[model samples]
Target: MIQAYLGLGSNIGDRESQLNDAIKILNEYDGISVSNISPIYETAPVGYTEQPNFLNLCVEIQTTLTVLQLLECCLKTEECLHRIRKERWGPRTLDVDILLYGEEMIDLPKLSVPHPRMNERAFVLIPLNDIAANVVEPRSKLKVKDLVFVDDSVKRY
Candidate 1:
C-alpha cells in the first residue's frame, strides 16, 4: 500500500463538522485505510482573502490506489461535502488536496503530487509534520520535521 498525505480544510458553515465529514467519507473508500489524523489548525484565508478562517488538518492514509485514483478520491470527498466552486482559495464547504503520495514527485493535467504549493503553506506543513515528520520530501530531500514552515497568520486551534 502507498502511503499518502491528504490536506483537508473548511471555511464555510460548520467548518469543523465539514472536516470531520471529509475524514469519515474518505476512510470508507475501498482500498483505503485512514491511519493518522493531525490536530486541527485555524488560519486566515489565503489567495482569496475576503472569507472566514479555515480549520485545516492533514490525514495519512494507507492505500493501494494510484496517484490518479487517489486524486479522484479526494475530489469525491470534496464533492460529497458540497464544496462549491468559487474564487481562488475562496471560502468553501471543503477543500481537499493530495499533499504527498509516497515518495513520488508528479505533475499532471489535473494533479500534482507533493502539492505544488505545500512547501509554502504553514497550515499545510504544520499539520503534515504531525503525522509524517520523518517522511522525506521527494524534491527537497529534507526530513518533514525540518520543514517547520509556518505562516505568521496561522494559529493552532
Candidate 2:
C-alpha cells in the first residue's frame, strides 16, 4: 500500500461537520484507511483573503490507489460534499488535497505527486508534522518540521 497524506479544509456552513463528513467518506473507500489525523487549525485564507477563515487539518492514509486515481477520489469527495469550483481558493464546504504519495516522483498533465506546494503551506506542514515529522521531502530532502516553522501564522483552532 502507498502511504499518502491528505490536507482537508472547510469554511462554509457547518465547517466542522463538513470535515467530519469528508473523513467519513474517505474511510468508507476500499483500499484506503486513515492512519493519523491532526487537530484542526483555524487559518486565514491564502490567495483570497476576503473570505471566512478555514478550519484545516492533515490526514495520513495507507492506500493502494495511484496518483491519478487518488486525485479523482478527492475530486469526487469534494463534489459529494457540495463543493463548487467557481473560484480559485474560494470558500467551500470541503477541500481535499493530496499532499504526498510516498516518496515517488510523478508529474502528469493532470496530477503531480509530493504535492508541488506542500513545502510552502504552513497549514499543510504544521499538521503533517503531527503524523510524519521525520518524513523527508522526496525532492528536497527537507524535514517536514522545517517547513512547519517557515510560517508564523498557523495556530490551533
Candidate 3:
C-alpha cells in the first residue's frame, strides 16, 4: 500500500457535510484506508478573496491504487458530491487534491504529486503540520513544519 495525503476543502452548501461525505466515499473504495485527519480550519480564500471562506483539512491514507487511479477517484468524488467546475479556484461543494503520494514525484499531464502549490498555501501547510509535522517532503526533504508558517487569515473553523 502507498501512503497518500489528501487535502479537502469546501466553501459552498453544507461545507462540513461535504468534507465528511468525501471521507465516507474514500473509505468505501477498496484497498484504501483513511488514516489520520487534521481538525477543520475555516480560511479566507487566497487568490479570490471575494468568494466565501473555505473549510479545509488534511487527510492521510493508505491506498493500493496508482497515482492516476487515485486522481480519478478524487474527481469521481467531486462529481458525486455535485461539485460544479465553473471557474478556476471558484467556489465549490468539495475539492479533493492529492498533496503527496507516498514518496513518488509525478509530473504527469493530468496530475502532479506533492501538489504544486502545497508549499505556498498556509491552509494546506498548517493542517499538514498538525497531522504530520515530522513527515518530510520527498522532493525537498523539508519537514512540514519547516516549510513555512500559516498566515493570520487562516484559522481554525
Candidate 4:
C-alpha cells in the first residue's frame, strides 16, 4: 500500500458536507482507506477572485491503487459531489486534487502528482502540513512543513 495525500475544497452548496462526504466516498473505494485528516481551513479565492471563500482540508489515505487509478477515484468522488467544470479555478461544489502519491513525481497531460502548484499555495500547504508535516514533496525535495508560508488569507475553519 502507498500513503497518498489528497486535497479537498469546496465553495458551493454545503461546503463542509461536500468535504466530509467526499472523504466517505473515497474511503469506500475498493483499494483506499482514509487514515488521517487535517482540520479545515477557510481561504479567500486565489485564482478566480470573484467566487466565495473556500473550505479546504487534506486527507491521508492508505491505498493499493496506482497513481492513475487513485486519480480516477478522486475524480469519481468529485463527480459524486456534482462537481462542475466551467473554467480554470472556477467555483465548484467540490475539488479533489491528488497532492502527492507516495513520493512519486508524475507529469502527464491528464494529471500531475505533487500537484504542480502546491508548494506556492498557502491553502494547500497549511492543511497538508497539519496532517503530513514531515512528508517530503518530491519535486522540491522539501518537507510539507517547509513549504508552508504565513498567509493571512487562510484561517482555521
Candidate 5:
C-alpha cells in the first residue's frame, strides 16, 4: 500500500460539516482508508480574494489505488457533495486536492503530483506538516517541514 495525503477545504454552508462529510465519504471508498487527519484550520482567501474564509485541513490515507484512481476518488467525493466551480480558488462546499502520493513524481496534463504549488500555500503546508512533516517530497527532495512557508495567515480552528 502507498501512503498518501489529501488536502480538503470548505467555505460554504456549514464549512466544518462539509469537510467531515467528505471525510466520511472517503472513509467508505474502496482501496482507501483515512489513517490520519490534521485538525481543521480557518484561512483567509489567498490568490483570489473577495470570498468567504475557508475551513481547511488534511487527511493522510493508506491506499492501494494508483495516483490517477485516487484522484478520481477525490473528484468523485467532490461531485457527490455537489462541488461547484464558479471561480478559480473560490468558495465551495468541498475541495479535495491530491497533495502527495508517496515520493513518486508524476507530471500529467491534468494532474501534477506533489501539487505544483503546495510549498507556497500555508493552508497546505501547515496541515501537511502536522501529519507528514517528515515525508520527503519527490520533486523537492526536502521534507515537508523544510519547505519555507511564504504565507502564514492560516489559523487553527
Candidate 6:
C-alpha cells in the first residue's frame, strides 16, 4: 500500500454532507480507504467566480490501486454524486482531485499529479498541509508545509 492524497470540494448543495459522502464513497471503494481528513474550510470560487463559495478539504488515503485506478476512483466519486461539468472550475455537487499519489510524478493527458497548481492555491495547500505537511511534491522538491502560503480567503468552516 502507498500513501496518497485527495482534495475534495462541494458548493452545489449540502456542501458539508457532499464532502462527507465523497469521503465515504472513496473509503468504501475497493483498494482505497481514507486514513485522515483535514478540517473543512470555506473559500470563494476560483475561475468562474459567480458561483457559490465552496467547502473544501483534503484527505489522506491508503490505496492498493495504481495512479490511474485512483484517478478513476476520484472521478467515479464525483460522478456518483452527480457532478456537472459546464464551465472551467465551474460549480458542482462534488469535485474530487487527485492531489498526490505516493511520491510519483505523473503527467497524463487526462490527469496531473501534484495537481499542477496546488502550490499556488491556498484552498488546496491549506488543508493538504494539515495532513501532509512533510510530504514533498516531486516536481518542486518542496514540502507541503513549505509550499503553503497565507491566504485570508480560506477560512475554517
Local distance difference test, each candidate: 0.88, 0.86, 0.90, 0.93, 0.90, 0.92
Candidate 2 lDDT, 38-124, residue by residue in tens: 998888778655888889999999999877888888988999899978746577999999888898888888887788887878888
* Candidate 2: pairs in clash: none
List TM-score per model, in order.
Answer: 0.94, 0.93, 0.95, 0.96, 0.94, 0.96
1-157, model 3: which lDDT tens digit per residue? 9988999999999999999999999878887789999999999898765999999999999999999988988889999999987647578999999999988899988898889999999999989989888888888889888985959878888
Over the stretch 8-112, how does candidate 4's per-residue lDDT look in tens digits?
Answer: 999999999889999999999999999999999999888655789999999999999999999999999988999888756577999999999998999999998
- Deviation (Å) of 59 in candidate 1: 0.3
Measured by lDDT, the strongest candidate is: 4
Residue 48, candidate 3: how far off, in angstroms? 2.5
Pitting candidate 1 against candidate 5, the one with the higher lDDT is: 5
Please state the error at residue 2 of candidate 4 in Å.
0.5
Residue-wise C-alpha lDDT for candidate 1, range 14-131, written one tens digit per residue? 9898899899999999978999999999987776647788899999999999989888888998989888885554578988899989999998878888898888788888888989
Please tell me which predicted candidate would have the highest TM-score against the true structure: 4
Candidate 3 lDDT score at position 144: 87
* Candidate 5 per-residue C-alpha lDDT over 1-157 given as tens digits, one digit per residue, 9 for 90 to 100: 9999999999888999889999999989899999999999899877875789999999999999999999999999999889888745556899899999989888999799989988788999898899998999878799998984756578889
* Reference-based lDDT, residue 66, model 2: 77
Per-prediction backbone clash count: 0, 0, 0, 0, 0, 0
Give lDDT for model 4. 0.93
Worst 10 residues of 1 by lDDT: 83-92
Give the runs in model 4 whose Cα sits over 4 Å from its true position: 87-89
Q: Measured by TM-score, how close is model 3 to the native structure?
A: 0.95
- What TM-score does prediction 1 earn? 0.94
The predicted structure with the larger lDDT, 4 or 6, is 4
